[PDB]
């Protein structure tokens, strides 16, 4: 009925989608084969007892997609939703937007069209990608504008792996980030920033894991998305719709980059000594270091807040904790938004994956905040562009793919305007 269509672009998107789909299949008891009501919101039941996710995997290189084809979930995904290319963008937004994307965007467009034709209550689209990767910027932006012009006001959500100010695999990340942000600002309804270094720190200090691989990061991201989607996939005291997210956390269309936070992130041995309360988890979540974006919110302000509690939490307890923290002077809120809160209570306890770093607990909270600290990073990011543009470094690479030198300056001034809009 109320289906949602997932898109994964780039290697990061593919890995995150794999983790998310295994997590949901475990949550609904779906076998890797696909066997065993809200599951219809994400998995179509075809023929007899067989179920297939409404997912599309696309990349300009066949490595990760082929690995997914060889994964245990091969019996889950129907073969042709997976898309493979020949030449990767190679950390080049122009390569992934003009060279290869311009002739393979139609394939993913047809895939999502045939998926949407068999769904009647499509709430919106989810996209997972990375700014640093050339594919995850260029092809993401391209398919995003295709979806926007094919749908207009249909809600779309973006999960961008925002490269860290110091952890950035591609040395040309500022160019791709600026270009793709200029390209995606107008039509991406709501993009969520995620910092890899922040996740590393949170995992190492709270979960007390010395050496976590990307598997743990993918577990955390899948848990976040599961907490987000539990409203549609499960009943609750106050269910929240996807349209409400862009209705609440968008004071103005320009500023639509809210960050996310999770609580609690503890090991089982820690979980023995800790009993869960709404107040403790909420104040821990509002603690700046618990956020997976490397920015101090207290350096800015707060424009909106959205708590998502899952489990058995009394609404009076949530109201009391939220009011008490609102009374606290630690966090400042913008004057023209005195009432910028939203609370979603759900009766589904968070799912635990076997071998997972997270420990199964009754209560859990996912927080979404549109703070002002984000612009800070943007400014720094813009500064990086300057340090890589005064010498015109790497310009020839993007010039060779069909760019125009003026577009770089246009994107730079556009993002300067976005920054000073705060």
């Amino acid at each position: 009925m109320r289906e949602c269509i997932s898109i994964h672009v780039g290697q990061a998107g593919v890995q995150i989608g794999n983790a998310c789909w295994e997590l949901y299949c475990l949550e609904h008891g779906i076998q890797p084969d696909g066997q065993m009501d809200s599951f219809n919101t994400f998995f179509s039941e075809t023929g007899a007892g067989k179920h297939v996710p409404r997912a599309v995997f696309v990349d300009l290189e066949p490595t990760v997609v082929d690995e997914v084809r060889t994964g245990t979930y091969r019996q889950l995904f129907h073969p042709e939703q997976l898309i493979t290319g020949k030449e990767d963008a190679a950390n080049n937004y122009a390569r992934g937007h003009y060279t290869i994307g311009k002739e393979i965007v139609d394939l993913v467009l047809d895939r999502i069209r045939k998926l949407a034709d068999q769904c009647t209550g499509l709430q919106g689209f989810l996209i997972f990608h990375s700014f640093g990767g050339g594919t995850g910027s260029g092809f993401t932006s391209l398919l995003m504008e295709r979806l926007s012009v094919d749908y207009g006001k249909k809600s779309k959500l973006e999960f961008a792996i925002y490269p860290a100010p110091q952890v950035s695999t591609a040395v040309v990340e500022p160019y791709n980030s600026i270009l793709t942000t200029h390209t995606t600002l107008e039509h991406s309804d709501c993009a969520f920033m995620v910092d890899n270094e922040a996740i590393y720190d949170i995992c190492r200090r709270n979960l007390d894991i010395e050496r976590p691989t990307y598997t743990n990061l993918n577990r955390l991201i899948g848990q976040i998305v599961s907490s987000i989607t539990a409203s549609l996939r499960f009943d609750g005291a106050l269910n929240v719709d996807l349209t409400e997210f862009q209705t609440n956390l968008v004071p103005y269309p320009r500023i639509h980059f809210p960050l996310v936070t999770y609580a609690p992130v503890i090991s089982a041995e820690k979980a023995y000594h800790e009993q869960l309360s709404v107040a403790e988890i909420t104040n821990a979540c509002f603690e700046p270091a618990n956020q997976m974006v490397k920015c101090d919110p207290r350096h800015g302000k707060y424009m909106a807040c959205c708590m998502l509690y899952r489990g058995d939490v009394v609404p009076k307890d949530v109201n009391a904790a939220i009011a008490t923290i609102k009374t606290k002077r630690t966090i400042q809120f913008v004057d023209w938004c005195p009432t910028g809160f939203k609370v979603g209570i759900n009766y589904q306890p968070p799912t635990v994956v076997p071998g997972g770093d997270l420990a199964k607990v009754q209560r859990a909270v996912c927080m979404l905040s549109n703070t002002t600290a984000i612009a800070e990073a943007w400014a720094r990011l813009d500064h990086k562009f300057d340090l890589m543009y005064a010498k015109r470094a790497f310009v020839h690479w993007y010039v060779g793919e069909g760019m125009e030198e003026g577009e770089f300056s246009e994107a730079r001034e556009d993002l300067a305007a976005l920054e000073k809009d705060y």
């Binding site: 490595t63 690995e67 110091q166 005064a390």
Partner: protein, 426 residues
């Protein structure tokens, strides 16, 4: 699927290519003949990148051998893994340039060029998609540098889309192996800068230093040197050929490590490299490798990076790593070594990890560095060229073969412009 054509020139190029082919066959689990004997499906998952499926469970390398003398290719045929190659792919001359670039590019190359272009076009079109060309030669010799320059020119005018990397062996500054090696180096560099996307500088004296000191071996041999260079090559290509937690390919390295079209020269580095007894006294951890990658001793380029500055750095790793530790380690490198790093390139370090470790080592790392130290090398060559041009020594051989003094003047001017650009960007 992104097939790669292997081309080797000269004795050094052919020997290094042979060693590289045995290393690759070991990595892919290929027997001494070519029959598949891998232990995992991932060995044959991308086997087509360096092999073609012959009839009857057989695989032949995508290789081409070029020489102006029929001797060393005969040794390759009679050497280990000699039956894996397709005999017709071998292409040999009959004269021998004799360490003369003009002979190896205008007189004796003008007839083998047709055959080598025919065979390279055969290999290119017979495959699905040719990602690029990897060459192996030395600039000191005559047939090597001349054939490499001719091949890169013809390929570039034929395929302006596919990137090519050349593993050229720089002449050793410590000994002038051939009196005419500055001329050959200058001409080869002048052709490479325009017709090659990137180059790696490897010097025999650095390999000797590593063997005696780092590897602690009493008797170095060319086999060991070729083995180290082949290990570097395999580590570079393992990102494409094997799945990785953060995949990469040749285009990724080119885009990350090339800030300007003409500043595309690189330094290789490998780790770990330990003697027989040292292996049990050092833990096989990532910090134990990061301490070993960043030092002038482990750079196979005869130029200390500490004098100059690092433009860019790329680091590929293989094995079982929780590479957030690699991230914070690169942060430590950026912090402590801030002086040696350029300032106008924020976060100048590229990092990639391939799941499968190399055969015999549980975990290893390879380093690709673009810095201003190589400038000195090039700078030095210039004076030698001048020191060998004012007296007009050995100009008769090149003049008689169809070259000109204006050609040498233009080549020297281009070399001076390139070294001036490296110095200016410091």
């Amino acid at each position: 699927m992104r097939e790669i054509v292997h081309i080797q020139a000269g004795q050094c190029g052919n020997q290094i290519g042979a060693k590289f082919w045995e290393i690759i066959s070991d990595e892919h689990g290929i027997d001494a003949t070519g029959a598949y004997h891998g232990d995992s499906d991932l060995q044959l998952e991308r086997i087509n990148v360096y092999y073609n499926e012959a009839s009857g469970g057989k695989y032949v390398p995508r290789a081409v051998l070029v020489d102006l003398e029929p001797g060393t290719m005969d040794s390759v045929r009679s050497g280990p893994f000699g039956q894996i190659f397709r005999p017709d792919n071998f292409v040999f001359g009959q004269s021998g340039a004799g360490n003369n670039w003009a002979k190896g590019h205008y007189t004796e190359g003008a007839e083998l060029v047709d055959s080598v272009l025919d065979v390279v076009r055969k290999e290119a079109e017979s495959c699905d998609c040719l990602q690029g060309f990897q060459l192996t030669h030395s600039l000191g010799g005559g047939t090597g540098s001349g054939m490499g320059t001719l091949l890169i020119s013809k390929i570039r005018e034929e395929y302006p889309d596919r990137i090519m990397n050349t593993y050229s062996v720089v002449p050793s500054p410590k000994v002038s192996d051939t009196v005419v090696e500055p001329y050959n180096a200058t001409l080869s560099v002048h052709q490479l800068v325009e017709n090659t996307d990137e180059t790696y500088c490897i010097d025999n004296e650095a390999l000797y230093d590593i063997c005696f000191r780092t590897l602690k071996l009493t008797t170095p041999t060319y086999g060991d040197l070729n083995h180290l260079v082949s290990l570097t090559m395999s580590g570079v290509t393992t990102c494409l050929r094997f799945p990785g937690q953060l995949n990469a390919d040749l285009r990724k390295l080119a885009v990350n490590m090339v800030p300007f079209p003409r500043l595309h020269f690189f330094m290789p580095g490998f780790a770990p490299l330990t003697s027989r007894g040292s292996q049990q006294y050092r833990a096989l951890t990532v910090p134990e490798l990061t301490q070993q990658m960043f030092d002038a001793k482990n750079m196979m380029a005869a130029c200390d990076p500490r004098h100059g500055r690092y433009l860019t750095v790329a680091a590929i790793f293989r094995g079982r790593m929780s590479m957030k530790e690699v991230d914070e380690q690169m942060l430590n490198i950026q912090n402590k070594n801030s002086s040696y790093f350029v300032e106008w390139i924020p976060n100048n370090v590229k990092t990639a990890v391939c799941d499968i470790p190399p055969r015999g080592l549980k975990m290893s790392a390879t380093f690709i560095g673009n810095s201003t130290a190589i400038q000195e090398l090039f700078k030095r060559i210039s004076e030698q060229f001048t020191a060998m041009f004012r007296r007009k020594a050995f100009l008769h051989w090149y003049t008689g073969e169809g070259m000109d003094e204006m050609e040498f003047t233009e080549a020297e001017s281009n070399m001076n412009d390139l070294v001036s650009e490296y110095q200016q960007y410091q």
